Structure formats: structure tokens, C-alpha cells
Amino acid sequence: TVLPLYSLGPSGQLAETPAEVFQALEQLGHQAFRPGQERAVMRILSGISTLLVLPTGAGKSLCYQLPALLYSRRSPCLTLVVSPLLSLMDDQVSGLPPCLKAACIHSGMTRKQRESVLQKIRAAQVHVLMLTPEALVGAGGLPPAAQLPPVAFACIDEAHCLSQWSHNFRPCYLRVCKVLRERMGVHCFLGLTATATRRTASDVAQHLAVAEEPDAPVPTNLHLSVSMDRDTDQALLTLLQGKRFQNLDSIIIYCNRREDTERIAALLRTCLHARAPKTTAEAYHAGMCSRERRRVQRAFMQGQLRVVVATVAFGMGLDRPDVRAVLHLGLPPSFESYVQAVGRAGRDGQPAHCHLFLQPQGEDLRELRRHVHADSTDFLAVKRLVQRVFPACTCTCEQLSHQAAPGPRRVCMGHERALPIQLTVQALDMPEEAIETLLCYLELHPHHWLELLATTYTHCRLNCPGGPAQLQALAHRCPPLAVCLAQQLSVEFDMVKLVDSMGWELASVRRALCQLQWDHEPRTGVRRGTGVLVEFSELAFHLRSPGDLTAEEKDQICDFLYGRVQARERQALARLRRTFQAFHSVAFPSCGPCLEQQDEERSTRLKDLLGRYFEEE
Ligand SMILES: [Zn+2]
């Protein structure tokens, strides 16, 4: 357990910022605190959770780097930074003193990667660990907090994903905070987000147990325009050659599909072929390997590449000052996504120009709507999922393998079940993220009892060289194997069925089964290998739910979950309509009128619309 670095003064007020923090701040490279950074850093150094909403992505890294540096100087500890896979996909390396490491899904070394990082942690050669959310609550997960150094605090990047009001709600973020509190000892969180309304930011503060406090107006030097050209490719060439854009040398163009980035980049390179030396345009999307993305971003940072054509999803994790223009080929899916992308231009006070090309026949809004309706879960899927999660048990009425008679009725104390992910996805026609979402909906509800224990392998297969006689000979070493061989009038079975029927823990069953690779020589001990093969498979949700629900109670559960599915859909549709209405209300038929100078009345009117959207509760 890590004690707070700084202690509160009398009456509970924050202690005055010491000299040490400033020294550390200079050491990292930044020579000044951005607004709200000094207070937030002092909060974490005192053990107080805090939410920080930043207008631009710049300065987000310093908020966890300075406390991690100071927490690690006092006593060997570890700071967890949770951020999406895109953030760690390309081996990002920060300041050297921290000695950071990343464990993510993309790491294709399996336990070797995680253990090498674990072994590096054990050698104190790691003080900041960056985990994608899926790695923290996935199959591999993290070792117990006892094996790990004590955690000073956890930084939650993209904290808006916790709230059902944000543009990008991800239920696994609810699981992350739960595991960090229960499995780990983390009760001091730093929430970092760059895009959130007052309704979303206040909801995140509820989840992180942060006191509410005011903490993104679009800058005055950004000049916005919107048009509905007939041919977007032709219009893009016409706009970039106009006087408003022809002398801007740092442009980002956001596209919907990544096949489009390579086409637009190749188009600009051929139609603008000509001080004199520098590269015109390069595509930047997630399909490219890690090397080519690093080079493209490096070239853009060094002013050697004029245009980067990227997808909205990959976007630009890089922050560069004096970015001159941001263009959108297609309606953005939300105000948050637009302001984030546009907020990258004009970091210096110098003027920056942004133009959005709406699809003339409205096909971009129709595609976004088609996606929302496709992500909706059918009611039959919700009904079939509830039946699989709350199946009837024999506690209140043979059916049980080890009962010859029903026996006296009992009050159901819950059962542990394995919901196989791949099997349920193909049987119910719903993706894994939707199943996870509905399970998270049920756990949060107070009246409905469900526990999402873990995501792990629950199926076990045992192949024997000696056939059936060799497997029977090992029944004295493994009580789980003993009850299986009796039930059977290569063997595989469900390990969570064993858990519930014999009262064991899933780990205890897993240990005893893999102990089947050792045998004791009759003379002495000299444990030697049995040669049996033990393989775990069928990744599943490990649940704990009652088995005594009536049909009426299951129906009420379905109405709850389906109501949440429809309300999430009505919210996503309402966000699309409100987003299109704003850009259209300010749009021209072509980019001709804004080839020379933007319309200040129109640019100001749009910037005021966005401002009132985020200042709303
Ligand atoms: Zn029961």
C-alpha cells in the first residue's frame, strides 16, 4: 500500500505547491503549468481523485508523468495509465526517467510479453505501466496485487467512456474501475478527457468519486466553413488551390474509410506535383504497419510532409503546434469528435482554417444512421440472453448427477456459470461488446443480482497417451477428475459446472487439473511426467446469478435491458440529427464563396452553437 506523498494542511485545504513539483515540471520538459494542471497534480500527490477536462490534447501526458515521477522517487511503486489500443499501438515512449512499459492486446508475445514486463516490474525497471482496458479485464489480465509493487494511483485516459451520455461509451471502462478498486488497491484516480459536455463530465466525476467543480470554447483564431459540393474530390482540389488554403503547409484531412485516405493522398500527390522540396500528402490509417505510421507522423512533426490524410478513428495521437488547417470529408458523427479534430489546428494563436464537406445527397448521414440501427440489439436476443444467464436451478425443484433423489428444498445461494463468448455470439447474433454491455447493465442495477466475476477459459481437455486406463489411474491426485470419471457411464468438460457442483473455486479446480502432468514414482518420490496434455479453451464470461427467478421476474429483466437498448439508440439518433442540423444551418452549396475568406458571421455562428452545446447540463 502506497501512502499519499503530500498531506493536507489544517481544515483540509490543499498544501501549497512545493518547490519539488516545479523542479520535476522543468525536468520533464514543460516550462509552465497549463491552466488547471497545478491544482490537479497537487490533488493526486495528496491521494485525492480528480477529473481534469482539457480543451486540447496538449498537456494530458504531464498530468500523470509528474506525480508518477515524484511517487517513484520516494518509494518503489507503480502507476497505471489506462488508454485505448490506438494510443499504445505504435510503441510510444515518453520521458526516460519514468521507465514506462506497455502491455496490450497487440503485444503478440502472450505471457512472454506480459511476464517480461512483469519480470521488468520485479526488477524495479518499470514505474509507469500503460494498459489498454481490454488487457486489464481480459483473459490474461494482471497478476495479483500482492506480486506487484504498490500502486500510487491510476490514470484513466479518455475518461468520458465511463458515461452513458458521452459519444463513445464503452462498458469495459466500468469493469476497469471495478477491478482497479477490488482486485488492486487503487482508490485514487486521475480522469483525463479532452471532449465532454457538462452533463458527461459531471457523470464521470460520480464514477471516480470526485467533487464536482467547473473545468472548452473553440478558439477565436479558428475560422470554420461548411459546403455541400457536387463532387467532393474535385472540390477538395479547388479549395486547396484557393487563396485561403494555397499557402498553408500543415493540413489534416479526415476521411470515413481508410481505403479513402490512400485514394485522397495519392490524388493530392499527383495533382499537386511540382521552398521547393517536401512531400505533398501521405495516408495514415490503422491498416498500415507500425513503422510506416511512425515515419508519416515524424515527417508531419518536422514540417517535411504538408498533408496527412487520416481516418477519424486513428486520428492524430500526435500533438503539433502551428497546424494550419483541418478538413472533414463527410459529416462528423458528433460534436465531440469534431471539436477534438479541429482543436488540433491553431495551437499557436495564428489563424487556422477548417472546412467540412457535407455529402450533397445526404448519404453520409444515412450511413451513420444505418450503423446505429445495426448496432441495436433485437429484443429476441435480449430474451435469449436472459434465459442463458438465469437458468433454473434444482434448489427449489435425478437432475443433479450426485443426487439419487431430489432432497429437501433450499434457498438458492447463487450459482457460478460460464457463458461461452464465441458460442453465444454465433447463437444470438450479437457482438461480444453488446453481451458485455447488457451484463454490465445488470450488475449496476441494485434489485437485479448479477456478478461478472471475470473473463477466462472455462473448458478443459485432457488427452492421454495411455488412453482410458492411464486417465483413471490419476483420479487419486485430482478430485475434480474423480467426479468426472464417475459421471461418464481424450476427455473434455466444463470446469465451472464442476465449481458449482462440488463447491470449489475456479482457480483450485484449474490447479488440480494441470497437476495431472506429474506422477509420483512408487519408489521414493521423484516426481515424473505423466505425459497427459492439459489445454484450456472456450473463453467465457464467469457469472454468478440466482437460479430461482420466476418467469415473471425474467420478463421484467428483459423490459429493463431492452429499455436501455432503445434509450441508447434514441440518444445516438438524437445526437446525429442535432449534429447535422448545426453544420447544415451554416452550409454553402459549394466552397466557392469561402475560397478567399471565410464568412465571419457564419463561422462565429457555428462556434457559438458548439459552445452552447458543451456549456449545457
Ligand atoms: Zn440454486
Numbering used by the authors: 449 to 663, 668 to 726, 735 to 857, 883 to 974, 984 to 1111
Study authors write:
RecQ proteins are ATP- and DNA-dependent super family 2 (SF2) helicases and separate double stranded DNA (dsDNA) in a 3′ to 5′ direction. Remarkably, RecQ4 entirely lacks the RQC domain, yet its helicase activity is required for various DNA protective functions. Here we present the crystal structure of the human RecQ4 helicase, encompassing its central ATPase domain and a large fraction of its unique C-terminus. Downstream of the ATPase core, we identify a novel domain, which features homology to WH domains of various prokaryotic DNA-binding proteins and coordinates a Zn2+-ion, yet lacks structural resemblance to the conserved RQC domain.
